Amino acid sequence: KKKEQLMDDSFIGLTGGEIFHEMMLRHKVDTVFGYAGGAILPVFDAIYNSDKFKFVLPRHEQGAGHMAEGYARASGKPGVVLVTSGPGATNVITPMADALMDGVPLVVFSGQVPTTAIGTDAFQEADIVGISRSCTKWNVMVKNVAELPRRINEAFEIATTGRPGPVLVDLPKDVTASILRESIPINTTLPAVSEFTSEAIKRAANILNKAKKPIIYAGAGILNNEQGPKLLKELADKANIPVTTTLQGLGAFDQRDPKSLDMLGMHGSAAANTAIQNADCIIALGARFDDRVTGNISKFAPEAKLAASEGRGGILHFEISPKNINKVVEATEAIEGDVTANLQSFIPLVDSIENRPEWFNKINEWKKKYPYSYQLETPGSLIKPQTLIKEISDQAQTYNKEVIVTTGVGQHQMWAAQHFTWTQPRTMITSGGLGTMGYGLPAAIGAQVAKPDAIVIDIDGDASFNMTLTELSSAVQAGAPIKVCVLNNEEQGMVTQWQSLFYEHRYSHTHQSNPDFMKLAESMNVKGIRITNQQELKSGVKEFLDATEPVLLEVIVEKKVPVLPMVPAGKALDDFILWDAEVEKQQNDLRKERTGGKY
Amino acid sequence: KKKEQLMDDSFIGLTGGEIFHEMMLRHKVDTVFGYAGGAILPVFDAIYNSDKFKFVLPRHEQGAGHMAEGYARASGKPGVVLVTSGPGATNVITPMADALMDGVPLVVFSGQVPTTAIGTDAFQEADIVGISRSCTKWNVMVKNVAELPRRINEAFEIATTGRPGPVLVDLPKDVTASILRESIPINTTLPAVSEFTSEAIKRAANILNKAKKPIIYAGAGILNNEQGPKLLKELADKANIPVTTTLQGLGAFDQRDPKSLDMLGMHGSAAANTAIQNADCIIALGARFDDRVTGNISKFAPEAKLAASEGRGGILHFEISPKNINKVVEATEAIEGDVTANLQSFIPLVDSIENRPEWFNKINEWKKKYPYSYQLETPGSLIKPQTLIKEISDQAQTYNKEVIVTTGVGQHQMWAAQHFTWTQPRTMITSGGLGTMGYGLPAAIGAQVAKPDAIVIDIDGDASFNMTLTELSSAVQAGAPIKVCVLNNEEQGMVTQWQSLFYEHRYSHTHQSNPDFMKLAESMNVKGIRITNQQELKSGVKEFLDATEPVLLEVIVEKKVPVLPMVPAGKALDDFILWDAEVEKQQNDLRKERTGGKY
Amino acid sequence: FEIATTGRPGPVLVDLPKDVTASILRESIPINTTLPAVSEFTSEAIKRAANILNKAKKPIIYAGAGILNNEQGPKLLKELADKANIPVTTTLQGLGAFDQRDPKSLDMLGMHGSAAANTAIQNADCIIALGARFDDRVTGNISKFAPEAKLAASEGRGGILHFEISPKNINKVVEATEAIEGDVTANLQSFIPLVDSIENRPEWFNKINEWKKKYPY
Ligand SMILES: Cc1cc2nc3c(=O)[nH]c(=O)nc-3n(C[C@H](O)[C@H](O)[C@H](O)COP(=O)(O)OP(=O)(O)OC[C@H]3O[C@@H](n4cnc5c(N)ncnc54)[C@H](O)[C@@H]3O)c2cc1C
Ligand SMILES: Cc1cc2nc3c(=O)[nH]c(=O)nc-3n(C[C@H](O)[C@H](O)[C@H](O)COP(=O)(O)OP(=O)(O)OC[C@H]3O[C@@H](n4cnc5c(N)ncnc54)[C@H](O)[C@@H]3O)c2cc1C
Ligand SMILES: Cc1cc2nc3c(=O)[nH]c(=O)nc-3n(C[C@H](O)[C@H](O)[C@H](O)COP(=O)(O)OP(=O)(O)OC[C@H]3O[C@@H](n4cnc5c(N)ncnc54)[C@H](O)[C@@H]3O)c2cc1C
Ligand SMILES: CCOC(=O)c1ccccc1S(=O)(=O)NC(=O)Nc1nc(I)cc(OC)n1
Ligand SMILES: CCOC(=O)c1ccccc1S(=O)(=O)NC(=O)Nc1nc(I)cc(OC)n1
Ligand SMILES: C/C(NCc1cnc(C)nc1N)=C(/S)CCOP(=O)([O-])OP(=O)([O-])O
Ligand SMILES: C/C(NCc1cnc(C)nc1N)=C(/S)CCOP(=O)([O-])OP(=O)([O-])O
Ligand SMILES: [K+]
Ligand SMILES: [K+]
Ligand SMILES: [Mg+2]
Ligand SMILES: [Mg+2]
User: Fold this and answer.
1) Which residues bind Mg(2+) (chains A, B) (predicted)?
2) Are the C-beta atoms of residues B565 and B578 closer than 8 Å to each other?
3) Which ligand has the shortest distance to the CA of C64?
4) Best CA proximity match to B36, nearest among B74, B71, B5, B64
5) Does residue B174 sit in the same domain as residue B223?
6) Which of A7, A52, A123, A310 is catalytic?
């Protein structure tokens, strides 16, 4: 009788595919990104004409994967991928690796050959559990239909807890075709703070209450709770602390606030970099001390390390994954768990501070000294890429709509980060840890599906865009009115920047040929706009943002322009290269000479 | 003094990148397919403006991978890939899995973050040695520059010996930037039959000399020696044996020869399938008894199994990889090693046979009974895809040039296999084991680079072509005048065929939207031709083949047409579905009714 | 415990970090976690297997450790051997599954098994393999193993009937004429009623008895 209460008969008579369909509904999945094939047909048959979720069909499964990532990042829900065996599955490996590195909850369901064929080098058989082991938090192959609901629950749970990340569930065709004939545990059919941590929070507060030069270093983890940005602001306001963010934390703090130091790191603000190198207390909120951020690790945060040794400061690391505590830099206090929940406990213990005259005097001087400067347009010159980004940023904020930005990877990505003004959470959707070129367009489609009333802008490089441009058709078929801006410098700019700097202007295979982007747009049934000169910039960007359909904007921009500031490999975070007009002129002359006028 | 003779100083003072360059030259590499990035820059700097090999730049590293596969398959040389760390490397996983399943010698060099950063979740770091372990024969991470020449030799050796296949060599940036300061073993700077096998060959010959109903089942392994097709023909002629081939063995035997039974298997000739089910001796030459070929394994080759039990026949398996001997079916005699070398020993022991009247009477009757029939065009109907393939096959054989065919994956692939007449080795370049949609275009570019004087035709499906169509730009930039024919049925035809047959015409997500292929071609700077009706077929195909530049031909073809014959899952090889005009009419009516006239 | 004891039984390991076993449970957990029919495909295979055995003139049971994994296993093995009048050999790991004092006992087969058992399996037209995995200590030269049963399978009058719980070990070494997947004892309950009772097999047991006399240890 109690047994009857704990077992469930309600799935008996359903196929594995039908059970999958029901479990999607129970997990409140409203969107699936995927692509059919022989091994996964029993599942596709079950979801045939389903009105329970939207299905989004890409042109390539890598597209499905990055779409699901963009969806997850925009929505805070897991991105669900459904693909076939063999090459359907191996085509999702880059998106899984990408999702792992950026903490994106991706739940990948891959068809598999029947259990009777596994291990025989069967038709369309890949060892996807073996291949994806290193780029997933967890994966599994389902071996019978009775365990399918359990494995689906486990996948969603692992994907969305701790540091979020990708999981894969392998679905043999005979399992999804088979019918459940037995009852299963009813729990499988449904989806306080430690004293140790409480004490660490108290000690952390006592340390911050001594600090004379505090700084908040905030990252993606603060975005994983709806109240995160609110509590970050409450802390910064209460204790009067300047705030810098990573690339992935952009939008966590209102950059219009005077306490904003903007982005730190290799291409972040020299003010932010100076401040963290001089701070006596660093409050690290959901950020992992990535090697793009720390500069030379041995030279990182010297004032905070000194303060820790003298018992008057240090690094206070609020981190959900023990793996990333004390991985790169020693935390003075490690506060384990969800940063937003732990901030609720922390802030009441923190003393309110009215002013910090000497510290904010330095902060304000550094901000004034270190803007994102660059060489402006001159008469007859091409549009500068930095100017283009400012133009899009300024005009997009006109509309009464949320604005979400995705990017490719390269210089355009860095100029997007620098020159947009970031004010809202989950509005920067960019591949940071893995750095996957081609991410921008499919991620924008996923973000647009997640947020159908948002303006979604893909700031893309021409080489990045070439990687995955076939997905323009997918945007049209999905009814996703994304706005793609290709910064066309006819080069892999990020790489040519390094070849200019370190390889004496030897541009080895870094200039790919581009298609005609306007005829390409036309072939894909998307609106095309081309801006070729300075006098077309404002009106072309307006036309781009006013469009109510998918649109591709191509902008011809200045070539061989470096992203600055730059902390070169090996250098301390405050040992940066700054923009200088005269240096840029000399560098142009040198490049011209070295390449016999070719570049 | 002997020590001096065995050590080599000649690489001292070179960077790892320069050593890589030199080892490419020593391995007679004439083409590298690749794409730059930060981790692999020291190697790109070393190969800057090299006149030692052609470098081919794709738009996506998956493209580089399939290009190298097409190159390897066309040339018989290893295909060399050079990519960066992180997503550059993970993007080559599908081509590696593809190459593993089809026995393609692929040598993949991936940049990696410096050894000082490995294992730190570094910028653009993937565990590519872990990820690629299951889809390579072998892989390695080079840990110091002194071992780089050795690891390069090992890679090429493993890739090209035994059953050929993919290998990966991971190249940390600090290793390729570092300079060799010490001498290294000189052997590292440079690139009889067993009595057991001799006895097996003698026993095999005695078995064949008893056979009354022999058949040769020949596959890809016969293509791995230049003399393979010659010795296959010598055996078939001498002992008077009919010859069937796999998909991957097409071209190994001249299909114009009366002894040709054409392709066997799931969609192969019902004559070939009948013959192998009735043969008393099966000579398996470089073929692996794939599950697309055997049909229901327990019901496969019953006459040969009977003959083996009665000591008058059986299966004689000439196979280079012990893993694939007795993996699927028991060999009566296993002859291990290179099939062509072992045929040189075998054929002299085999008795010449003038005629086999009763057997060839059956063979000839079966060939007459079982052509590749289909429903012909009717007035006003669309072009039938089978007719299109015959047209291309007939016209291509006009030219005084070698003709190499690549394909995508799906019905078009099967109709290409059936309806071309295959006569020369290494002219069918198709993804068979993994079955990767998107293969056709990049494989054609690689094949065209391998064979610059050949006509190279990609017979492609519209969904397959959408996967990787960005590589059209690559064909232009590489100067590869490939000929792409898109069979446009506006459907994933292979999958809709299964949904029609097994899922009552429920077409779940199997109709992707297509771009305008003519405007697409124009945007890519490639010539475009569109055939929309029967009266344009001959002249449009002529224009396509006459072109002396890259060209995309789109042909509008009949939709919802099944590939026949077909051996359904679970059925014996001789339990096939054959084309029947009346059945096709009923099936059309049923489809129309079920879908309310939509399909 | 579930994985260790189901399918083919085997070892499992659970690693217990010291801070986990020292830590105290502070939250509720799903109550299910606090507590420890035959397919039509298999039903059809059992029927075909019975029809094959009902044709056999020289059957032999090759029984192994799997028959010991159900308390009723040896009982059903004996019921089958008695009903259809079949001599029984066992592996090393199946010793004790059959009463070796029974005249139908051929003793152990294999590398160091009885030459009577080895002769009988090489001459049998139907081999009923009950919970045994065709180990390389048992089969001898695999290509030369069971030639009369292979011949019979090809002629549609015998073969190898493999009752096996682990799909990995079906068709791993030797091709089964019929594979009967699942617990051998449960499947024997279904099989035996379909099997014809046989009073005598004079010519076969004449050979069996001569071989036993000829080949003592
Ligand atoms: C060309 C290029 C240049 C780049 N240059 C820069 C640069 O100059 N500056 C820069 O900042 N980035 C740069 N990056 C990005 C960089 O590589 C990293 O992706 C980024 O810095 C990581 O930011 P993050 O630590 O906030 O996010 P993540 O990498 O996602 O790390 C988040 C951390 O927070 C933890 N966490 C997650 N959820 C929670 C939670 N609920 N509670 C507590 N903790 C949680 C995670 O476990 C993790 O340790 C660049 C990328 C590219 C492609
Ligand atoms: C949609 C679709 C349908 C298909 N249907 C069919 C079909 O109907 N018929 C068909 O044939 N295929 C079909 N295939 C292809 C099938 O999946 C396999 O790829 C193909 O049958 C393998 O052919 P193979 O054994 O000759 O080549 P491989 O898979 O390359 O196997 C070659 C064998 O020869 C060995 N070998 C290699 N080199 C040597 C050497 N030097 N000496 C000796 N041995 C060597 C290898 O080790 C290996 O065991 C289909 C594919 C797709 C995508
Ligand atoms: C020196 C030496 C010499 C040896 N020589 C011999 C010899 O001459 N003869 C000999 O027999 N052995 C010999 N062996 C032993 C041999 O190596 C194997 O261990 C033995 O033959 C395996 O017997 P088995 O197949 O019955 O048991 P196992 O290896 O346990 O195989 C049992 C099979 O039954 C299956 N099974 C398990 N439970 C069930 C169930 N409930 N229902 C259905 N199937 C089930 C299993 O999955 C498995 O496939 C020797 C060992 C040594 C050390
Ligand atoms: C592709 C998925 O392959 C398998 O899962 C499979 C693999 C090995 C053995 C048996 C099978 S299967 O029989 O279960 N299914 C099957 O072959 N399906 C199928 N679907 C289509 I669409 C096409 C096609 O052949 C061109 N085959
Ligand atoms: C991308 C390759 O990254 C590394 O190999 C690396 C990884 C971790 C730590 C240190 C290094 S590295 O210092 O050796 N090289 C480096 O950072 N190169 C680089 N190249 C470009 I082009 C851009 C860029 O940043 C945008 N960084
Ligand atoms: C090749 C490369 N990086 C290496 C690389 C290679 N391959 C992949 C899939 N991803 C990356 N990051 C870059 S950043 C060039 C980007 O060029 P772009 O997209 O035209 O952008 P931009 O010119 O603004 O630097
Ligand atoms: C989806 C699919 N197969 C599953 C699949 C999914 N994804 C990949 C990367 N490869 C494969 N093989 C096929 S065959 C449809 C092919 O459609 P097509 O290229 O238009 O060819 P055709 O219509 O001639 O069958
Ligand atoms: K900014
Ligand atoms: K043909
Ligand atoms: Mg660019
Ligand atoms: Mg199609």
Assistant:
1) 462, 489, 491
2) yes
3) 3
4) B64
5) no
6) A123
Method: X-ray
The answer on whether B525 is annotated among ligand-binding residues is no
Among chain C residues, the shortest Cα distance to A179 is held by C39
* Whether residues B49 and B67 fall in one domain: yes
Query: Domain boundary at A158, A174, A191, which?
Result: A191
| Distance of CA B419 from the midpoint of ligand 6 (Å) | 42
Measured at the CA of A545, the angle between CA A544 and CA A548, to 5 degrees, comes to 90
A337 and A393 share one domain: no
Minimal-distance CA residue of chain B relative to A83 = B509
CB B284 within 8 A of CB B316: yes
Q: List the domain range (segments joined by +) for residue B16.
A: 1-191
Could you tell me where the beta strands, DSSP code E, fall in A105-252? 106-112, 138-141, 167-172, 184-185, 214-218, 243-245
Q: Reduce the DSSP state of residue C78 to 3 states and report it.
A: helix
The residue whose CB lies within 8 Å of the most ligand 5 atoms, and thus the one to mutate among A101, A494, A507, is: A494
- String of DSSP letters for A536-578: GHHHHHHHHHH-SS-EEEEEEB-SS---SSB--TTS-TT--B-
Contact residues on chain B for A288, CB-CB shorter than 8 A: 121
The answer to whether the beta carbons of residues B67 and B34 sit under 8 Å apart is: no
User: CA C121 → CA A347, A477, C129, C175, distances in Å?
Assistant: 81, 65, 11, 15
CA–chain centroid gap for A264, Å, is: 16
Distance CA A491, CA A477 (A): 30
HEC assignment per residue over A436-485: CCCCHHHHHHHHHHHCCCCEEEEEEEHHHHHHHHHHHHHHHHHCCCCEEE
Give the resolution in Å. 1.8
CA–CA separation, C80 vs C85, rounded Å? 8
Rounded to whole angstroms, how far apart are CA atoms C217 and C205?
20
Q: Which residues of C touch B (CB under 8 A)?
A: 143, 147, 150-151, 154-155, 175
A300 with A377, same domain: the answer is: no
Nearest CA to ligand 5 atom 18: B38
CA–CA gap between residue B348 and residue B201 (Å, rounded) = 11
B457, B445 in Cβ contact below 8 A? no
Residues of chain B with C-beta less than 8 angstroms from the C-beta of C147: 309
Judgement on whether residues B149 and B208 belong to the same structural domain of the protein: no
Whether residue B399 is found in the same domain as residue B518: yes
